[PDB]
Amino acid sequence: PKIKTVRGAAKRFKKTGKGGFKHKHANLRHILTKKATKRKRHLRPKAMVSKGDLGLVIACLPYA
Amino acid sequence: RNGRDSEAKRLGVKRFGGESVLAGSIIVRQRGTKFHAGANVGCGRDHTLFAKADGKVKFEVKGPKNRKFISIEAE
Amino acid sequence: DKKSARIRRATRARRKLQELGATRLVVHRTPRHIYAQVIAPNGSEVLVAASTVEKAIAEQLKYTGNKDAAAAVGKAVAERALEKGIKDVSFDRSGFQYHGRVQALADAAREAGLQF
Amino acid sequence: MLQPKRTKFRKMHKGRNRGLAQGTDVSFGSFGLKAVGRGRLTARQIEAARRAMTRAVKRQGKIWIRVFPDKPITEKPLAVRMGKGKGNVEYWVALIQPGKVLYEMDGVPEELAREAFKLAAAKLPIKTTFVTKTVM
Amino acid sequence: GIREKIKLVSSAGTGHFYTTTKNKRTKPEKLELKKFDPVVRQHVIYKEAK
Protein backbone atom coordinates (compact mmCIF):
# COMPACT_ATOMS: atom_id res chain seq x y z
CA PRO A 1 0.00 0.00 0.00
CA LYS A 2 1.02 3.61 -0.54
CA ILE A 3 2.39 5.60 2.38
CA LYS A 4 -0.11 7.48 4.55
CA THR A 5 0.61 11.14 5.23
CA VAL A 6 0.53 12.23 8.86
CA ARG A 7 -2.52 14.47 8.70
CA GLY A 8 -1.55 16.42 11.81
CA ALA A 9 1.80 17.30 10.24
CA ALA A 10 0.20 18.38 6.96
CA LYS A 11 -1.83 21.01 8.85
CA ARG A 12 1.26 22.68 10.36
CA PHE A 13 3.98 22.61 7.67
CA LYS A 14 3.94 23.98 4.12
CA LYS A 15 6.63 23.09 1.59
CA THR A 16 8.56 25.88 -0.13
CA GLY A 17 10.48 26.29 -3.37
CA LYS A 18 13.88 25.03 -2.19
CA GLY A 19 12.45 22.06 -0.28
CA GLY A 20 12.17 23.82 3.07
CA PHE A 21 9.15 24.04 5.34
CA LYS A 22 7.41 27.02 6.91
CA HIS A 23 5.50 26.77 10.17
CA LYS A 24 3.66 29.09 12.53
CA HIS A 25 5.41 30.06 15.75
CA ALA A 26 4.16 28.20 18.81
CA ASN A 27 3.74 30.78 21.57
CA LEU A 28 0.99 33.16 20.27
CA ARG A 29 -2.26 31.42 21.25
CA HIS A 30 -3.22 32.63 24.74
CA ILE A 31 -1.74 34.21 27.86
CA LEU A 32 -0.85 37.27 25.79
CA THR A 33 -1.38 40.18 28.20
CA LYS A 34 1.84 39.49 30.11
CA LYS A 35 3.89 39.22 26.90
CA ALA A 36 5.82 42.18 25.51
CA THR A 37 4.69 43.50 22.14
CA LYS A 38 8.21 42.92 20.83
CA ARG A 39 8.03 39.18 21.49
CA LYS A 40 4.50 38.86 20.08
CA ARG A 41 5.46 40.89 17.01
CA HIS A 42 8.44 38.66 16.26
CA LEU A 43 6.33 35.50 16.58
CA ARG A 44 3.75 36.66 14.02
CA PRO A 45 5.68 35.89 10.80
CA LYS A 46 6.16 32.32 9.66
CA ALA A 47 9.54 30.68 10.27
CA MET A 48 11.56 27.96 8.59
CA VAL A 49 11.93 24.48 10.06
CA SER A 50 15.34 23.86 11.60
CA LYS A 51 17.80 21.45 10.02
CA GLY A 52 17.88 19.03 12.95
CA ASP A 53 14.14 18.30 12.83
CA LEU A 54 13.86 18.60 9.05
CA GLY A 55 14.48 14.88 8.68
CA LEU A 56 11.57 14.16 11.01
CA VAL A 57 9.29 16.40 8.95
CA ILE A 58 10.25 14.64 5.71
CA ALA A 59 9.15 11.27 7.08
CA CYS A 60 5.83 12.60 8.40
CA LEU A 61 4.68 13.98 5.03
CA PRO A 62 6.47 12.08 2.25
CA TYR A 63 3.93 13.14 -0.39
CA ALA A 64 3.54 16.86 0.31
CA ARG B 1 16.74 20.68 52.35
CA ASN B 2 19.20 21.84 49.69
CA GLY B 3 19.47 20.74 46.06
CA ARG B 4 18.17 23.76 44.12
CA ASP B 5 20.09 25.71 41.49
CA SER B 6 19.51 28.01 38.53
CA GLU B 7 20.41 27.51 34.89
CA ALA B 8 23.68 29.22 34.02
CA LYS B 9 23.26 32.50 32.15
CA ARG B 10 26.42 32.21 30.02
CA LEU B 11 27.64 35.72 30.81
CA GLY B 12 31.15 37.02 30.16
CA VAL B 13 33.07 38.71 27.38
CA LYS B 14 31.97 37.59 23.92
CA ARG B 15 34.43 39.67 21.87
CA PHE B 16 37.95 40.29 23.13
CA GLY B 17 40.30 43.19 22.55
CA GLY B 18 41.75 43.62 19.10
CA GLU B 19 39.21 41.72 16.98
CA SER B 20 36.88 43.33 14.46
CA VAL B 21 33.12 43.20 15.04
CA LEU B 22 30.01 44.12 13.09
CA ALA B 23 27.57 46.80 14.16
CA GLY B 24 25.08 45.51 16.71
CA SER B 25 27.19 42.55 17.83
CA ILE B 26 27.26 41.76 21.54
CA ILE B 27 30.65 42.46 23.14
CA VAL B 28 30.05 41.79 26.85
CA ARG B 29 27.18 40.14 28.71
CA GLN B 30 27.04 41.21 32.35
CA ARG B 31 24.64 41.62 35.25
CA GLY B 32 25.80 45.06 36.35
CA THR B 33 28.21 47.34 34.51
CA LYS B 34 31.66 45.89 35.09
CA PHE B 35 32.63 47.53 31.79
CA HIS B 36 31.15 50.87 30.77
CA ALA B 37 30.27 51.83 27.21
CA GLY B 38 32.89 53.96 25.50
CA ALA B 39 32.98 55.30 21.95
CA ASN B 40 30.65 53.73 19.37
CA VAL B 41 29.43 51.35 22.09
CA GLY B 42 25.88 51.26 23.42
CA CYS B 43 24.49 49.88 26.68
CA GLY B 44 21.36 47.74 26.69
CA ARG B 45 18.60 47.62 29.26
CA ASP B 46 20.24 44.56 30.86
CA HIS B 47 23.65 46.31 30.80
CA THR B 48 24.69 44.39 27.68
CA LEU B 49 27.37 46.19 25.67
CA PHE B 50 26.97 46.10 21.89
CA ALA B 51 28.81 47.70 18.99
CA LYS B 52 27.14 50.74 17.45
CA ALA B 53 29.68 50.87 14.60
CA ASP B 54 31.96 48.52 12.70
CA GLY B 55 35.58 48.33 13.79
CA LYS B 56 38.11 46.97 16.25
CA VAL B 57 37.17 46.61 19.91
CA LYS B 58 39.58 47.74 22.63
CA PHE B 59 39.52 47.92 26.42
CA GLU B 60 40.86 50.78 28.52
CA VAL B 61 40.77 52.28 32.01
CA LYS B 62 39.61 55.88 32.40
CA GLY B 63 38.00 58.28 34.85
CA PRO B 64 38.84 59.13 38.45
CA LYS B 65 37.58 55.70 39.59
CA ASN B 66 39.73 53.69 37.16
CA ARG B 67 36.61 52.00 35.80
CA LYS B 68 36.96 49.88 32.69
CA PHE B 69 35.61 51.11 29.35
CA ILE B 70 35.05 49.40 26.01
CA SER B 71 35.45 51.40 22.80
CA ILE B 72 35.45 50.72 19.06
CA GLU B 73 37.77 52.34 16.52
CA ALA B 74 36.91 52.31 12.80
CA GLU B 75 39.85 50.24 11.56
CA ASP C 1 30.67 73.92 48.16
CA LYS C 2 29.21 76.01 45.35
CA LYS C 3 31.78 74.82 42.80
CA SER C 4 31.47 71.15 43.76
CA ALA C 5 27.68 71.30 43.51
CA ARG C 6 27.90 73.03 40.13
CA ILE C 7 30.38 70.55 38.66
CA ARG C 8 28.26 67.65 39.89
CA ARG C 9 25.21 69.28 38.30
CA ALA C 10 26.80 69.70 34.87
CA THR C 11 28.72 66.41 34.74
CA ARG C 12 25.89 64.44 33.13
CA ALA C 13 25.32 67.02 30.39
CA ARG C 14 29.04 67.35 29.66
CA ARG C 15 29.43 63.58 29.36
CA LYS C 16 26.36 63.35 27.12
CA LEU C 17 27.70 66.02 24.77
CA GLN C 18 31.17 64.46 24.88
CA GLU C 19 29.98 61.03 23.76
CA LEU C 20 27.63 62.60 21.20
CA GLY C 21 30.68 64.22 19.61
CA ALA C 22 29.48 67.71 18.72
CA THR C 23 30.79 71.24 19.12
CA ARG C 24 29.36 72.74 22.31
CA LEU C 25 28.86 76.34 23.41
CA VAL C 26 29.90 76.51 27.06
CA VAL C 27 29.02 79.52 29.20
CA HIS C 28 30.55 80.44 32.57
CA ARG C 29 28.65 82.93 34.74
CA THR C 30 29.86 84.95 37.72
CA PRO C 31 28.66 88.07 39.58
CA ARG C 32 30.59 89.97 36.90
CA HIS C 33 32.06 89.22 33.48
CA ILE C 34 29.93 86.42 32.07
CA TYR C 35 32.10 84.27 29.81
CA ALA C 36 31.34 82.09 26.81
CA GLN C 37 33.38 79.58 24.82
CA VAL C 38 33.07 77.19 21.88
CA ILE C 39 34.77 73.82 22.33
CA ALA C 40 35.63 71.21 19.71
CA PRO C 41 34.13 67.72 20.11
CA ASN C 42 37.43 66.32 21.39
CA GLY C 43 37.37 68.97 24.12
CA SER C 44 41.04 69.86 23.67
CA GLU C 45 40.85 73.19 21.78
CA VAL C 46 38.71 76.32 21.87
CA LEU C 47 37.29 77.39 18.51
CA VAL C 48 36.44 80.91 19.72
CA ALA C 49 35.70 82.75 22.96
CA ALA C 50 34.04 86.00 23.98
CA SER C 51 33.24 87.84 27.19
CA THR C 52 32.92 91.26 28.83
CA VAL C 53 36.36 91.04 30.47
CA GLU C 54 38.18 92.52 27.45
CA LYS C 55 38.10 96.23 26.65
CA ALA C 56 37.10 95.47 23.05
CA ILE C 57 33.61 94.53 24.29
CA ALA C 58 33.55 96.19 27.74
CA GLU C 59 33.77 99.77 26.41
CA GLN C 60 30.06 100.07 25.51
CA LEU C 61 27.81 98.42 28.10
CA LYS C 62 27.38 100.46 31.27
CA TYR C 63 28.01 97.52 33.61
CA THR C 64 29.26 93.99 33.02
CA GLY C 65 27.23 91.18 34.56
CA ASN C 66 23.62 91.99 33.67
CA LYS C 67 21.05 91.06 31.03
CA ASP C 68 22.51 93.58 28.58
CA ALA C 69 25.98 92.12 29.08
CA ALA C 70 24.69 88.61 28.38
CA ALA C 71 23.04 89.74 25.14
CA ALA C 72 26.23 91.46 24.00
CA VAL C 73 28.37 88.40 24.73
CA GLY C 74 25.71 86.12 23.28
CA LYS C 75 25.60 88.28 20.17
CA ALA C 76 29.38 88.65 20.13
CA VAL C 77 29.94 84.89 19.98
CA ALA C 78 27.47 84.71 17.09
CA GLU C 79 29.22 86.62 14.30
CA ARG C 80 32.54 85.19 15.44
CA ALA C 81 31.20 81.65 15.03
CA LEU C 82 29.49 82.52 11.74
CA GLU C 83 32.69 84.11 10.46
CA LYS C 84 34.67 81.05 11.55
CA GLY C 85 32.23 78.78 9.71
CA ILE C 86 30.74 76.57 12.41
CA LYS C 87 26.94 76.83 12.47
CA ASP C 88 25.42 74.11 14.67
CA VAL C 89 26.40 73.86 18.35
CA SER C 90 25.08 72.39 21.60
CA PHE C 91 24.37 74.76 24.48
CA ASP C 92 25.86 73.83 27.86
CA ARG C 93 24.34 75.26 31.04
CA SER C 94 27.47 74.35 33.03
CA GLY C 95 25.25 73.91 36.08
CA PHE C 96 23.70 77.38 35.77
CA GLN C 97 19.91 77.52 35.70
CA TYR C 98 18.63 78.46 32.24
CA HIS C 99 16.59 81.35 33.60
CA GLY C 100 18.26 84.77 33.54
CA ARG C 101 21.62 85.84 32.16
CA VAL C 102 22.25 82.36 30.74
CA GLN C 103 18.91 82.44 28.93
CA ALA C 104 19.55 85.97 27.66
CA LEU C 105 22.93 84.93 26.25
CA ALA C 106 21.42 81.88 24.55
CA ASP C 107 18.48 83.87 23.20
CA ALA C 108 20.83 86.46 21.70
CA ALA C 109 23.00 83.71 20.21
CA ARG C 110 20.19 81.68 18.63
CA GLU C 111 18.55 84.74 17.05
CA ALA C 112 21.98 85.80 15.72
CA GLY C 113 22.52 82.66 13.62
CA LEU C 114 23.69 80.00 16.09
CA GLN C 115 20.49 77.99 16.02
CA PHE C 116 20.34 75.05 18.42
CA MET D 1 37.64 23.30 74.30
CA LEU D 2 38.33 26.14 71.89
CA GLN D 3 35.52 26.80 69.42
CA PRO D 4 34.32 29.82 67.41
CA LYS D 5 31.08 31.68 68.14
CA ARG D 6 28.25 32.14 65.63
CA THR D 7 30.25 30.99 62.63
CA LYS D 8 28.92 32.02 59.22
CA PHE D 9 28.31 28.43 58.06
CA ARG D 10 27.82 25.18 59.95
CA LYS D 11 29.70 23.00 57.45
CA MET D 12 32.65 23.53 55.13
CA HIS D 13 34.53 21.56 52.50
CA LYS D 14 37.32 19.16 53.42
CA GLY D 15 39.92 21.17 51.53
CA ARG D 16 43.61 20.29 51.54
CA ASN D 17 46.53 20.82 53.91
CA ARG D 18 49.12 21.67 51.26
CA GLY D 19 51.44 24.62 51.67
CA LEU D 20 53.69 26.02 54.36
CA ALA D 21 53.15 27.61 57.76
CA GLN D 22 52.95 31.39 58.12
CA GLY D 23 53.42 32.08 61.84
CA THR D 24 56.88 30.52 61.93
CA ASP D 25 58.47 32.87 64.49
CA VAL D 26 58.07 33.53 68.20
CA SER D 27 56.10 36.76 68.60
CA PHE D 28 54.84 36.92 72.21
CA GLY D 29 56.92 34.77 74.56
CA SER D 30 60.56 33.73 74.72
CA PHE D 31 60.13 30.01 73.99
CA GLY D 32 57.79 28.15 71.68
CA LEU D 33 56.85 24.76 70.26
CA LYS D 34 57.24 24.55 66.49
CA ALA D 35 55.43 22.01 64.33
CA VAL D 36 57.70 19.81 62.22
CA GLY D 37 55.05 17.53 60.73
CA ARG D 38 51.83 18.23 58.85
CA GLY D 39 48.33 17.45 60.05
CA ARG D 40 45.37 18.71 62.03
CA LEU D 41 44.86 19.22 65.77
CA THR D 42 41.46 18.80 67.37
CA ALA D 43 40.16 21.04 70.13
CA ARG D 44 40.54 18.20 72.65
CA GLN D 45 44.22 17.73 71.81
CA ILE D 46 44.92 21.45 72.20
CA GLU D 47 43.19 21.48 75.59
CA ALA D 48 45.10 18.39 76.73
CA ALA D 49 48.45 19.90 75.76
CA ARG D 50 47.59 23.22 77.41
CA ARG D 51 46.67 21.51 80.69
CA ALA D 52 49.91 19.52 80.65
CA MET D 53 52.10 22.64 80.50
CA THR D 54 50.12 24.67 83.03
CA ARG D 55 50.59 21.85 85.54
CA ALA D 56 54.25 21.50 84.57
CA VAL D 57 55.00 25.20 85.07
CA LYS D 58 52.79 25.29 88.20
CA ARG D 59 50.90 28.40 87.03
CA GLN D 60 54.16 30.34 86.68
CA GLY D 61 54.72 32.55 83.66
CA LYS D 62 52.48 33.10 80.67
CA ILE D 63 51.01 30.73 78.08
CA TRP D 64 50.08 31.71 74.52
CA ILE D 65 48.01 29.57 72.15
CA ARG D 66 48.82 30.39 68.53
CA VAL D 67 46.32 28.01 66.89
CA PHE D 68 42.52 28.04 66.80
CA PRO D 69 40.28 25.22 65.46
CA ASP D 70 37.86 27.38 63.41
CA LYS D 71 37.08 24.41 61.14
CA PRO D 72 34.17 22.02 61.78
CA ILE D 73 34.50 18.32 60.98
CA THR D 74 31.55 16.00 60.44
CA GLU D 75 31.11 12.25 60.94
CA LYS D 76 28.31 9.99 59.76
CA PRO D 77 26.48 8.04 62.50
CA LEU D 78 27.19 4.34 62.79
CA ALA D 79 25.06 2.12 60.53
CA VAL D 80 24.27 4.94 58.08
CA ARG D 81 24.42 4.49 54.32
CA MET D 82 26.34 6.85 52.06
CA GLY D 83 24.47 9.90 50.83
CA LYS D 84 21.40 11.57 52.36
CA GLY D 85 23.33 14.82 52.82
CA LYS D 86 26.38 16.07 54.67
CA GLY D 87 27.03 14.67 58.13
CA ASN D 88 26.55 16.55 61.37
CA VAL D 89 29.35 18.61 62.89
CA GLU D 90 31.22 16.74 65.63
CA TYR D 91 34.50 18.47 66.49
CA TRP D 92 36.69 21.38 65.43
CA VAL D 93 40.25 21.01 64.16
CA ALA D 94 43.08 23.38 63.25
CA LEU D 95 45.16 22.67 60.16
CA ILE D 96 48.89 22.68 60.93
CA GLN D 97 51.65 23.09 58.35
CA PRO D 98 55.37 22.55 58.98
CA GLY D 99 56.99 25.43 60.83
CA LYS D 100 53.81 26.53 62.59
CA VAL D 101 54.36 27.68 66.17
CA LEU D 102 51.78 25.94 68.34
CA TYR D 103 52.32 27.33 71.84
CA GLU D 104 54.43 30.18 73.16
CA MET D 105 55.64 30.70 76.71
CA ASP D 106 57.60 33.22 78.78
CA GLY D 107 58.57 33.92 82.37
CA VAL D 108 60.23 30.60 83.19
CA PRO D 109 63.79 29.24 83.03
CA GLU D 110 64.94 27.63 79.80
CA GLU D 111 65.57 24.32 81.58
CA LEU D 112 62.05 24.19 83.03
CA ALA D 113 60.68 25.31 79.66
CA ARG D 114 62.10 22.29 77.82
CA GLU D 115 60.41 19.67 80.00
CA ALA D 116 57.11 21.56 79.96
CA PHE D 117 57.02 21.58 76.16
CA LYS D 118 58.20 17.96 75.99
CA LEU D 119 55.24 16.88 78.12
CA ALA D 120 52.83 18.76 75.86
CA ALA D 121 54.31 17.35 72.65
CA ALA D 122 53.76 13.86 74.05
CA LYS D 123 50.00 14.51 73.75
CA LEU D 124 50.01 15.77 70.15
CA PRO D 125 49.80 13.81 66.88
CA ILE D 126 52.49 15.80 65.00
CA LYS D 127 56.27 15.94 65.27
CA THR D 128 57.33 19.08 67.14
CA THR D 129 60.54 20.84 68.12
CA PHE D 130 61.61 23.41 70.70
CA VAL D 131 62.52 26.91 69.49
CA THR D 132 63.69 30.10 71.19
CA LYS D 133 62.87 33.71 70.40
CA THR D 134 65.30 35.09 67.83
CA VAL D 135 66.73 38.61 67.74
CA MET D 136 65.16 39.99 64.57
CA GLY E 1 -2.35 37.17 42.14
CA ILE E 2 -4.98 39.68 43.23
CA ARG E 3 -4.12 41.92 40.28
CA GLU E 4 -6.58 41.22 37.47
CA LYS E 5 -6.63 41.92 33.74
CA ILE E 6 -8.69 44.61 32.01
CA LYS E 7 -9.29 45.83 28.47
CA LEU E 8 -8.69 49.38 27.24
CA VAL E 9 -11.08 50.30 24.42
CA SER E 10 -10.32 53.20 22.10
CA SER E 11 -12.69 56.16 22.23
CA ALA E 12 -12.82 56.07 18.43
CA GLY E 13 -15.26 53.82 16.59
CA THR E 14 -12.47 51.35 15.83
CA GLY E 15 -12.58 48.05 17.67
CA HIS E 16 -8.89 48.10 18.56
CA PHE E 17 -8.13 47.69 22.26
CA TYR E 18 -5.23 47.25 24.66
CA THR E 19 -4.95 44.76 27.50
CA THR E 20 -3.34 45.38 30.88
CA THR E 21 -3.74 44.68 34.59
CA LYS E 22 -4.90 46.70 37.58
CA ASN E 23 -5.77 46.28 41.25
CA LYS E 24 -9.43 47.00 41.96
CA ARG E 25 -8.92 46.92 45.73
CA THR E 26 -6.65 49.98 45.79
CA LYS E 27 -7.57 51.95 42.64
CA PRO E 28 -11.22 51.16 41.85
CA GLU E 29 -11.79 54.10 39.49
CA LYS E 30 -11.59 53.77 35.72
CA LEU E 31 -8.40 54.14 33.67
CA GLU E 32 -8.25 56.79 30.94
CA LEU E 33 -4.81 56.50 29.35
CA LYS E 34 -4.10 58.21 26.02
CA LYS E 35 -2.66 55.65 23.60
CA PHE E 36 -2.03 55.20 19.89
CA ASP E 37 -4.71 53.58 17.73
CA PRO E 38 -3.24 52.08 14.52
CA VAL E 39 -6.60 51.64 12.77
CA VAL E 40 -7.03 55.43 12.66
CA ARG E 41 -3.31 56.16 13.16
CA GLN E 42 -3.93 58.74 15.89
CA HIS E 43 -3.52 59.08 19.65
CA VAL E 44 -6.92 58.83 21.36
CA ILE E 45 -8.30 58.32 24.85
CA TYR E 46 -8.70 54.68 25.89
CA LYS E 47 -11.34 53.70 28.45
CA GLU E 48 -11.18 50.74 30.82
CA ALA E 49 -13.60 47.85 30.29
CA LYS E 50 -13.90 44.10 30.79
Add this chain to the structure above:
RNA sequence: UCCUCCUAAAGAGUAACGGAGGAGCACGAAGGUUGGCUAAUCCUGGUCGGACAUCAGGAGGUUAGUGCAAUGGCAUAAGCCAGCUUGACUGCGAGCGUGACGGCGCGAGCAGGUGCGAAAGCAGGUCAUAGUGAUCCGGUGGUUCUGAAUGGAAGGGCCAUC
Protein backbone atom coordinates in the same frame (compact mmCIF):
# COMPACT_ATOMS: atom_id res chain seq x y z
C1' U F 1 9.58 24.19 37.08
C1' C F 2 12.20 29.07 37.72
C1' C F 3 16.06 32.71 40.32
C1' U F 4 21.20 34.03 43.35
C1' C F 5 26.02 32.35 45.55
C1' C F 6 29.57 28.30 46.35
C1' U F 7 31.24 23.54 44.76
C1' A F 8 33.34 24.93 39.24
C1' A F 9 40.02 23.75 38.83
C1' A F 10 41.10 33.01 36.78
C1' G F 11 36.64 32.25 28.80
C1' A F 12 31.76 29.44 28.40
C1' G F 13 29.75 25.05 30.40
C1' U F 14 30.14 21.21 34.22
C1' A F 15 27.46 16.14 38.54
C1' A F 16 25.88 14.27 43.55
C1' C F 17 19.57 12.38 48.27
C1' G F 18 26.64 18.26 48.05
C1' G F 19 26.61 23.34 51.20
C1' A F 20 23.28 28.08 51.66
C1' G F 21 18.79 31.08 50.38
C1' G F 22 14.44 32.78 47.33
C1' A F 23 10.02 33.08 43.31
C1' G F 24 4.50 31.51 41.26
C1' C F 25 4.56 39.00 42.49
C1' A F 26 4.02 44.11 42.82
C1' C F 27 3.39 49.19 40.44
C1' G F 28 -1.15 53.87 36.27
C1' A F 29 2.54 54.63 39.74
C1' A F 30 7.14 52.43 42.19
C1' G F 31 6.83 54.04 34.31
C1' G F 32 8.80 58.50 30.69
C1' U F 33 11.18 63.21 30.77
C1' U F 34 12.84 67.92 33.03
C1' G F 35 14.77 70.44 37.43
C1' G F 36 16.97 69.82 42.15
C1' C F 37 19.19 66.91 46.38
C1' U F 38 23.12 63.34 48.62
C1' A F 39 23.60 58.66 53.27
C1' A F 40 24.97 54.88 57.68
C1' U F 41 27.51 55.40 62.24
C1' C F 42 29.70 58.42 65.93
C1' C F 43 31.14 63.31 69.12
C1' U F 44 29.28 68.13 71.53
C1' G F 45 24.91 71.55 73.14
C1' G F 46 19.62 71.52 73.81
C1' U F 47 12.02 70.59 77.55
C1' C F 48 9.44 66.70 78.33
C1' G F 49 13.30 63.07 75.64
C1' G F 50 15.35 58.34 78.21
C1' A F 51 21.27 54.28 74.80
C1' C F 52 17.99 54.96 70.63
C1' A F 53 12.19 60.57 68.06
C1' U F 54 13.16 66.04 66.18
C1' C F 55 17.04 70.79 66.02
C1' A F 56 22.39 72.96 65.41
C1' G F 57 27.54 72.03 64.49
C1' G F 58 31.77 68.61 63.71
C1' A F 59 34.48 63.75 62.08
C1' G F 60 33.04 60.41 58.28
C1' G F 61 32.96 59.42 52.72
C1' U F 62 28.43 55.30 51.16
C1' U F 63 29.84 50.84 56.55
C1' A F 64 23.31 53.94 53.87
C1' G F 65 19.72 53.16 50.23
C1' U F 66 18.19 50.64 45.95
C1' G F 67 9.40 47.41 46.69
C1' C F 68 10.98 41.29 47.66
C1' A F 69 16.57 36.23 48.51
C1' A F 70 21.39 36.55 46.83
C1' U F 71 25.27 38.19 43.48
C1' G F 72 27.07 42.03 40.27
C1' G F 73 26.31 47.22 39.67
C1' C F 74 24.89 52.19 41.01
C1' A F 75 27.74 59.80 42.38
C1' U F 76 26.80 61.53 35.40
C1' A F 77 23.80 58.45 40.61
C1' A F 78 20.31 53.03 38.89
C1' G F 79 19.49 56.29 45.64
C1' C F 80 15.95 60.87 47.53
C1' C F 81 12.21 65.12 46.23
C1' A F 82 8.97 68.09 42.78
C1' G F 83 6.54 69.86 37.88
C1' C F 84 4.47 68.15 33.27
C1' U F 85 3.01 63.58 31.28
C1' U F 86 1.50 58.10 28.96
C1' G F 87 7.16 55.70 24.62
C1' A F 88 4.01 50.30 29.60
C1' C F 89 2.85 53.22 21.35
C1' U F 90 1.91 50.76 16.09
C1' G F 91 4.44 48.55 11.68
C1' C F 92 9.41 46.87 11.25
C1' G F 93 14.46 45.79 12.08
C1' A F 94 20.78 45.62 10.02
C1' G F 95 23.66 42.64 13.30
C1' C F 96 24.57 39.48 17.42
C1' G F 97 24.19 36.17 22.18
C1' U F 98 21.92 31.45 23.73
C1' G F 99 19.91 26.73 23.07
C1' A F 100 19.39 19.38 19.95
C1' C F 101 14.86 21.61 18.89
C1' G F 102 10.40 24.14 20.43
C1' G F 103 12.24 28.62 21.90
C1' C F 104 14.51 32.74 24.84
C1' G F 105 17.51 37.42 25.09
C1' C F 106 20.06 42.18 23.39
C1' G F 107 19.59 45.72 19.60
C1' A F 108 21.38 50.56 16.31
C1' G F 109 18.31 52.33 12.59
C1' C F 110 13.68 53.51 9.16
C1' A F 111 8.17 55.05 8.67
C1' G F 112 3.79 56.83 11.29
C1' G F 113 1.92 59.44 15.43
C1' U F 114 3.08 61.24 20.81
C1' G F 115 5.32 63.05 26.00
C1' C F 116 9.12 65.98 28.62
C1' G F 117 12.97 70.22 27.60
C1' A F 118 14.92 76.79 25.27
C1' A F 119 17.84 73.08 23.08
C1' A F 120 21.31 69.13 22.16
C1' G F 121 18.55 64.98 23.38
C1' C F 122 15.80 60.91 26.17
C1' A F 123 11.47 57.58 26.14
C1' G F 124 9.35 50.59 22.28
C1' G F 125 8.04 49.84 30.88
C1' U F 126 10.55 49.22 36.00
C1' C F 127 19.32 48.93 38.25
C1' A F 128 19.77 43.85 35.89
C1' U F 129 19.21 38.69 36.81
C1' A F 130 12.95 34.62 39.30
C1' G F 131 7.07 36.34 39.19
C1' U F 132 5.86 31.17 34.56
C1' G F 133 2.73 26.49 30.77
C1' A F 134 3.43 24.09 24.30
C1' U F 135 -0.51 22.05 21.30
C1' C F 136 -5.62 20.63 20.96
C1' C F 137 -10.66 22.11 21.91
C1' G F 138 -13.86 26.30 22.78
C1' G F 139 -15.40 31.69 24.12
C1' U F 140 -15.39 37.32 22.96
C1' G F 141 -14.49 41.80 19.25
C1' G F 142 -12.77 43.26 14.30
C1' U F 143 -11.94 41.92 9.11
C1' U F 144 -16.86 39.93 2.23
C1' C F 145 -10.30 36.44 3.06
C1' U F 146 -13.35 32.14 2.15
C1' G F 147 -18.19 30.60 2.11
C1' A F 148 -19.01 23.67 -1.81
C1' A F 149 -26.05 25.64 -8.00
C1' U F 150 -26.71 31.18 -7.34
C1' G F 151 -27.54 35.74 -3.50
C1' G F 152 -26.94 35.49 1.67
C1' A F 153 -25.99 33.03 6.14
C1' A F 154 -23.82 29.12 9.20
C1' G F 155 -18.96 27.36 9.75
C1' G F 156 -13.80 28.13 8.82
C1' G F 157 -9.24 31.48 7.99
C1' C F 158 -6.45 36.05 9.41
C1' C F 159 -5.77 39.91 13.47
C1' A F 160 -6.46 41.20 18.84
C1' U F 161 -7.60 38.58 23.30
C1' C F 162 -9.70 34.90 27.15
